[PDB]
Amino acid sequence: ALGIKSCDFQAARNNEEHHTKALSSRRLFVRRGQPFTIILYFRAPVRAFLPALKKVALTAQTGEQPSKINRTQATFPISSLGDRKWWSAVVEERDAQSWTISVTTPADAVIGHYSLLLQVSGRKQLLLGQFTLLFNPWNREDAVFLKNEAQRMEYLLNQNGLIYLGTADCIQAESWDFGQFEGDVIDLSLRLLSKDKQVEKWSQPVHVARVLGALLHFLKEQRVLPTLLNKRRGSVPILRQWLTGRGRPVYDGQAWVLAAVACTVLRCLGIPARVVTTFASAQGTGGRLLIDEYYNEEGLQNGEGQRGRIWIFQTSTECWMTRPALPQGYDGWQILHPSAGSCDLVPVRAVKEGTLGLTPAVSDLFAAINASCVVWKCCEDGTLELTDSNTKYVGNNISTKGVGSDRCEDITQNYKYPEGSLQEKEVLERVEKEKMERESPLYLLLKAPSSLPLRGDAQISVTLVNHSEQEKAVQLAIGVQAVHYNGVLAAKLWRKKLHLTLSANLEKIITIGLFFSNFERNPPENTFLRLTAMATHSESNLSCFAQEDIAICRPHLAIKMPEKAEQYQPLTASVSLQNSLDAPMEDCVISILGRGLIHRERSYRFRSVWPENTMCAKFQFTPTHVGLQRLTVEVDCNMFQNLTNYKSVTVVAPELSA
């Protein structure tokens, strides 16, 4: 006399309570360690409540072979005596025909797809429905607990991210759609995680993060192709293409998207994560704190590059969890570091303090932001001369998106002590000691702007100081080369040879104009400018050298849009672009998109823009989703492609009326 009619999982209200409403309003997504409510409906009225309560039990199973030993299967009764810190169920409200049941899960529960089954005494198992269990940054007892609500909103609930690219002195923020709450992202992440057979460890955020980082790095190596090809629409299409093989592939000039894809997967599973960009990262050293750079007598580089290079930038995924298996004090931000393979979780503090030995990857991450650069001159005779070079600092302007804003947050102090400080000296000598136990008359100063306008003009200054008592015959070589983001040589653009005489004890300033029209070829897209100066005098056998990385600056895309907008009302955004180039802009396409504002994307064609003129396109659209939304605008033409800017708009609910 206890037959079940139906079970209402109340996906809308529970998903609102569990901060999973962006995932679905129909499927039940719950975070572990927090109660959720279901309604049980009976075919016939229940006469006596207490015996009926004694006659029912609930069962939760995950995976294909659930077992009590794996913690993948749990059986619990429905009573007020249940353990609220474990699997439990209590009837909170009841009618004659229905029970309102509050179900809890342990804060250390195995994540994934679950089935809820009801056991009536002397009857066969009845499936009540399906739900998906996630990590809970809102639960104090969870390993991924986050103290701040703002940090939870930024690192788990926000799908509108910013990946910082460019150079250290010219940081360009690219709008990124993480899209962790897209419909299939949770299913794709769990399917990828299912390639790991230690399902009992899926309760541990460290294990899940390591497994997913390794698998995603393997997929990135398998699917990213050697070199529109650079047009991006966030992490979700990349993840779909990596897992299914269908869609637009990613090419090696944008291999930095691995960090964003990992951030999306971790955020969708409930692990707080952020994308971190390190500028001037010394990659490929194996922990060695030295970088060898080789330049010819024209100040240019010949081959494709070395194995150990200083990248213009490198992206990485940081994730938030405790470290129970580590010595105390390493809870917080962890760096995902795949090793060609296996992935490692490195606390940021361990990198900062040089705690080489805590995890296997501490040495590589420490070398990435602490190596020194040694510059060699390759003479035409073949002999390799050492060079007196300016200091090339590594690990600059370590940046991530700020909390509760579109501003940029600098987090370099989490990774390094200030240069020349006592603490940095202590860390460096300790690391040197561990590794050792285990195993000129001329001064050049190069002044360059941080950016060069696209097809534009800039001025550079070389200051040469002669400290000899005699005048010097000095050959000054100036070179401009295009380099990819990962330090791979792209194209030789400009070379200039000067012959100067420096009076004794006299400083001389040489101003040189750096013009695009002087370049032997146009720099390839998404490349940076390596500017080098090389001063050689007589037969001193030593050359002064300085280098600077220059970003190519494109015209500013200005978006004008009201700060607030009413839901279900038309909203106009005007977009302007000034043609500051030396040619007309032809084949002009402008696209607008943004989740909660525009369904997918709309592409428009606008008229050709002559030099020194301005475009002014107005777009009208009606926002339909309440919240903090972002409009993303992309401009394509024959001079430049994938020029993206963004603007945030807060959409408010309509005023209440009758």
Swiss-Prot record:
Is the keyword Phosphoprotein in the record? yes
Residue runs in coiled coils: none
For this record, an example GO cellular component is: plasma membrane
Sites bearing Phosphoserine, chain numbering: S235
- List the Pfam families hit by this protein, alphabetically: Transglut_C (PF00927), Transglut_core (PF01841), Transglut_N (PF00868)
What's a single GO BP term from this record? multicellular organismal-level iron ion homeostasis
* Highest taxon in the source lineage: Eukaryota
Question: What happens to this protein after translation, modification-wise?
Answer: Both cAMP-dependent kinase (CAPK) and another kinase present in the red-blood cells seem to be able to phosphorylate EPB42.
Q: Where is this region: Band 3 binding?
A: 28-36
- Membrane topology type: Lipid-anchor
Show the InterPro entries listed in the entry: Ig-like_fold, Ig_E-set, Papain-like_cys_pep_sf, Transglutaminase, Transglutaminase-like, Transglutaminase-like_sf, Transglutaminase_animal, Transglutaminase_AS
A GO molecular-function term, please?
ATP binding
Cell compartment(s), UniProt: Cell membrane; Cytoplasm, Cytoskeleton
Effect ascribed to mutating R267Q: In SPH5; Tozeur
The Swiss-Prot or TrEMBL record describes its family as follows: Belongs to the transglutaminase superfamily. Transglutaminase family.
The record describes its quaternary structure and partners as: Component of the ankyrin-1 complex in the erythrocyte, composed of ANK1, RHCE, RHAG, SLC4A1, EPB42, GYPA, GYPB and AQP1. Interacts with SLC4A1 (via the cytoplasmic domain); this interaction is mediated by the SLC4A1 Band 3-I dimer. Interacts with ANK1 (via ANK 1-13 repeats). Interacts with AQP1 (via the C-terminal).
Disease tied to this entry: Spherocytosis 5: Spherocytosis is a hematologic disorder leading to chronic hemolytic anemia and characterized by numerous abnormally shaped erythrocytes which are generally spheroidal. Absence of band 4.2 associated with spur or target erythrocytes has also been reported.
Further facts: The substitution of an Ala for a Cys in the active site may be responsible for the lack of transglutaminase activity of band 4.2.
Q: What is this protein called?
A: Protein 4.2
Source organism of this protein record: Homo sapiens (Human)
